[PDB]
Amino acid sequence: LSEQLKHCNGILKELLSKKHAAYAWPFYKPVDASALGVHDYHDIIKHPMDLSTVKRKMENRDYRDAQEFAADVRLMFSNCYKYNPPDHDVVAMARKLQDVFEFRYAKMP
Numbered sequence: 001l002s003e004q005l006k007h008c009n010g011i012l013k014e015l016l017s018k019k020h021a022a023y024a025w026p027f028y029k030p031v032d033a034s035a036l037g038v039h040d041y042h043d044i045i046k047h048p049m050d051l052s053t054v055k056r057k058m059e060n061r062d063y064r065d066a067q068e069f070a071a072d073v074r075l076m077f078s079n080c081y082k083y084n085p086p087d088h089d090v091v092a093m094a095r096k097l098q099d100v101f102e103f104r105y106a107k108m109p
């Protein structure tokens with residue numbers, strides 16, 4: 001990994017850590033639309049994303065730079081904001097996790 005990608009990996013590890021689990025947990029694995037009963041999810045969300053997918057991509061060296069990584073993390077949040085009403089509990093969780101993400105991403109070397 002490049003130096004900037006190492007910082008990205010550090011952020012990813014933090015997003016997945018116990019420190020943030022109270023609001024990060026919905027983002028750990030791909031949304032299971034059937035399990036959640038949200039039978040319109042894949043009509044609304046054309047490009048699903050979640051932290052396990054970002055992690056696999058990082059491990060496989062799929063991201064060529066920090067910008068590509070950030071676009072995926074942001075896509076994950078955006079999907080949450082697109083599908084759910086803005087007053088929803090899961091949206092509040094997304095906003096909190098995104099605050100953690102954006103502030104640390106801003107500290108990129």
Ligand SMILES: CCNC(=O)[C@H](C)[C@@H]1N=C(c2ccc(Cl)cc2)c2ccc(OC)cc2-n2c(C)nnc21
Binds near residue numbers: 026080089
């Ligand atoms: C109909 C209610 N809305 C949903 O079920 C969402 C599709 C779902 N809500 C939730 C959700 C709803 C309420 C609370 Cl307090 C936390 C998460 C959700 C739950 C589990 C999960 O993976 C295991 C992913 C979730 N998620 C993400 C991420 N983005 N949207 C959701």
Ligand SMILES: C[C@H](O)COC[C@H](C)O
Binds near residue numbers: 098
């Ligand atoms: C809550 C907004 O959707 C994302 O805000 C990011 C800011 C760094 O908290």
Ligand SMILES: [Cl-]
Binds near residue numbers: 070
């Ligand atoms: Cl972006």
